[PDB]
Amino acid sequence: IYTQGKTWGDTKSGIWMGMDNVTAKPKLDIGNATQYIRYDGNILRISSEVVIGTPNGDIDIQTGIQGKQ
Amino acid sequence: IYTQGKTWGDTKSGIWMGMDNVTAKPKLDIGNATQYIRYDGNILRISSEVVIGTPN
Amino acid sequence: IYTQGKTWGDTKSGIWMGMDNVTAKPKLDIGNATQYIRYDGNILRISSEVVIGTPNGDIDIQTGIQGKQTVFIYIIGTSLPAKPTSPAYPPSGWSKTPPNRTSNTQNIYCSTGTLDPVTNQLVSGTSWSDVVQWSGTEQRGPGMYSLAIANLTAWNDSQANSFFTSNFGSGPVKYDVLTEYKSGAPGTAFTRQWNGSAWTSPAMVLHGDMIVNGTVTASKIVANNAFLSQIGVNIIYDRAAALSSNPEGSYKMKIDLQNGYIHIR
Amino acid sequence: AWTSPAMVLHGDMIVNGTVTASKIVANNAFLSQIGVNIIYDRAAALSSNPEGSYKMKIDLQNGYIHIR
Amino acid sequence: AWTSPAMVLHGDMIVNGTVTASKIVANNAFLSQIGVNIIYDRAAALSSNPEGSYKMKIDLQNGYIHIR
Amino acid sequence: MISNNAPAKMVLNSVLTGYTLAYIQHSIYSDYDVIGRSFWLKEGSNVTRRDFTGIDTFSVTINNLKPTTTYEVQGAFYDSIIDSELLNAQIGINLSDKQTFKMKSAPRITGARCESEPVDVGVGAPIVYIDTTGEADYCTIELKDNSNANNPWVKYYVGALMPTIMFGGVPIGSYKVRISGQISLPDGVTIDSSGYYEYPNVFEVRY
Amino acid sequence: MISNNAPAKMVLNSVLTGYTLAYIQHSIYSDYDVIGRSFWLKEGSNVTRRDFTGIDTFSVTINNLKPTTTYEVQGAFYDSIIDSELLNAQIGINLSDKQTFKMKSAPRITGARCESEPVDVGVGAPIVYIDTTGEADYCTIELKDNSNANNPWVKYYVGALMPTIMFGGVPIGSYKVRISGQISLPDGVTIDSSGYYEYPNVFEVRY
């Protein structure tokens, strides 16, 4: 499944997802030439900056936090 | 491609993946309103904790 | 949407992405049985090692970057001098080469820190080494490295070994890491750290900088520099003794645990 | 109590740049240059009051070694 | 200049293996064994030319300790 | 009979050349008192003696050079018995053999246009065509929106330099394309980056 | 006063091993009368002498070596004074100390197989699973349809040698498989390949 005129490991700005019978491994690519999330069965590469979680993800709901000197 | 009644910024839990002619950047969103993988065209955001590799 | 036959978390290679009506949580599964990126509604698992960022991603395009080391012997001195304070490759009225001396005088050198060719002066920090009288003639700290390959398809142990034995002429040391990228495509790259014998690819690689609002735990940490406000440790060896000699026979160590003392050796 | 971390690595990690964190815990640290103000014993540092530590290479202000 | 990193986290980090980086910054550290070539004071290490201005230095390689 | 033999003649491998930079891999010394290395650059009738006193590594890089100029490099290890004046006079040392090399040319762009992707149905997405001439590898290409003078420069391609370079993901509008190729060297951290050679002509991309 | 000097014994800086070619980095000669350099390999049972004309470069490439055979390297420069008979006697040569290295092993295929998933609708895509036992840095795999008397060998997989190799996109005819390993010499251009090892069995691609 992909956007029309898009191929994996290509400079186009489409999405590609499917089974690569040539290497018999699944493939993936979301993004333009520079910023992309490209995955090959052997290895995954994420060009763009990545953020995990959110600020105050594990903050106590009943009580906040604070600091003083 | 998306589950019915879903948008990249909706609070509904669902899957949304496709282009955006406004920026020509692919956009991907998968998860609920508090546990999700929001891939903006420029930055990849993950809410739920992630495990990399397997022990031994 | 899924390849025929594949199901979420199934052994056969394929992909799967869709809804879990009962749990009302999106699910995704991509990859083989051994390697896969599986995301349930509460956890994201990636078996295959992941590389985030690209080599030389955040470099200055106006000006490159390079590193160099210098060591100059620079006094016709009767007595041991005080080490230079000006960070200039020719220090304050200080020669760059061993001059001629009179019988009474002697020669003193300094293991100058890393030099920056672009600025032609000591990089910020890394002041001059202790001055030692030059008598006759004057392991290396593991560091990060990168190499360019004309046409790269996979990691090349032979190329890395040739690289180290060519540049440094001594082979890699433990904890060394070299990243190899295809010339004309920095996106495709392979990174491996040399420990013991041969190279072992790490489970994850980052090319820029890592920022963590919380804590970090690891079996061991190696870095060329550190700035810690408060540090708590039981034992502290010397780097060479710590890594080079497992028995830690030779040392110059402090011992916070048990009896606390200072040993010079 | 128990808690779930942000993300877990079951193998080693390589970072070509600098890594910043609120606090670090590890067994073995093989560095080449460290800038530290005050150092206590591992147990003493983990303690509520580090004043009872065995040794202190205080450097920010005092700059003296005191062994308890 | 303000610089965008490669990784951002907000919970905690776990690494079964080892983590390597060019340099490290952290407010606190709880370690067991350390092998280091040289130890400085944070104020000196952050400042350029640390050995020009350093409250206390120890050179483990050269077996030397200095207090001003 | 006691003596201090001079270092053996320095042997240089192929000169890896990047604009304003160089890389020379030489042999390994064997004398017991080798303390420094030097090279005599020769540009036209001008000779520059670049000296490196660091013996730790066996690769060297000249930080500063003149773009697109054939040079001549002669290197030599020198003992402690060689002084600054003696080294300047090239007396008492074994100099390397002559070697000729030429510098590289920064990438330059010839044209820029918007073309619609050939498709079997629907409105094919635009793809930007730019023709590139120069010498580099994985040259980076950027863009700037022409609506305002403060718009950021956005990278869009770092792939290998080709006579014709194509890429997508460009929003409809008018942009000024900027290129500055890169070329690395075997050395671990030496990377060469040219200046920015932006296209004088503004071009617009549309469906 | 007049005297003769034997070439200074060289030091073998390093040796990179190929299962057919050997790369050695050695110091540079320092005596004027030097005319050539020679080496004395040791198979462990028979001693083999190899010499290369010219002393321009610091590296050498010993060819025609028995794979999977450790060797010992010792050699030095011989000047015009040294004679062929005297060189064979190795009396005045003052050769370098010996050094032992292990010579790598060529790739081989442990087994050949092909399996594919049954499919409800459509056709199962053929795939080839082949398990190797080599140690080459990266290996290429060829194929040839054996049903016809003569067919040209065709490359289908290029990549790192692995315990198990997976590839697809191959036609239906029965095939014969040969596997070769290629290891890059320190010089980028030169690459040392292997004698093609072929699986005696011949199999149809799993359709």
Residue numbers in the entry:
A (entry chain f): 414 to 482
B (entry chain g): 414 to 469
C (entry chain e): 414 to 551, 562 to 688
D (entry chain g), E (entry chain f): 621 to 688
F (entry chain f), G (entry chain e): 1 to 207
The authors write:
In siphophage T5, the unique RBP is located at the extremity of a central fiber. FhuA, an outer membrane E. coli iron-ferrichrome transporter, is the bacterial receptor recognized by T5 (25). We present the structures of T5 tail tip, determined by cryo–electron microscopy before and after interaction with its E. coli receptor, FhuA, reconstituted into nanodisc. These structures bring out the important conformational changes undergone by T5 tail tip upon infection, which include bending of T5 central fiber on the side of the tail tip, tail anchoring to the membrane, tail tube opening, and formation of a transmembrane channel.
Upon RBPpb5 binding to FhuA, the central fiber reorganizes: The three FNIIIs strings dissociate, two strings relocate on one side of BHPpb3, and the third one on the other side. This reorganization of the central fiber is allowed by the long linker that connects BHPpb3 hdIV to the first FNIII and which now runs perpendicular to the tail axis along BHPpb3. The central fiber bends by ~160° at the level of the hinge between the third pb4 FNIII and pb4 spike: The latter is now surrounded and stabilized by pb4 FNIIIs, which interact with and stabilize pb4 spike small decoration domains. pb4 spike also undergoes structural rearrangement, with a different twist of the spike. This bending and stabilization of the central fiber bring the tail tube closer to the membrane, orient it correctly, and anchor the tail to the membrane. Upon RBPpb5 binding to FhuA, a constraint at the RBPpb5-pb4 interface occurs, resulting in the different twist of pb4 spike observed in its proximal part. This twisting of the spike would pull on pb4 FNIII-spike linker, leading to the disruption of the FNIII-spike interaction network. The association between this FNIII and the spike is thus loosened; the pb4 FNIII-spike linker reorganizes and stabilizes a new interaction network between the three FNIII strings and the spike. This series of events results in the bending of the central fiber, at the level of the FNIII-spike hinge, on the side of the tube, pulling the tube toward the host membrane. The map after interaction with the receptor contains the spike decoration domains and the FNIIIs while that before interaction contains only pb4 spike.
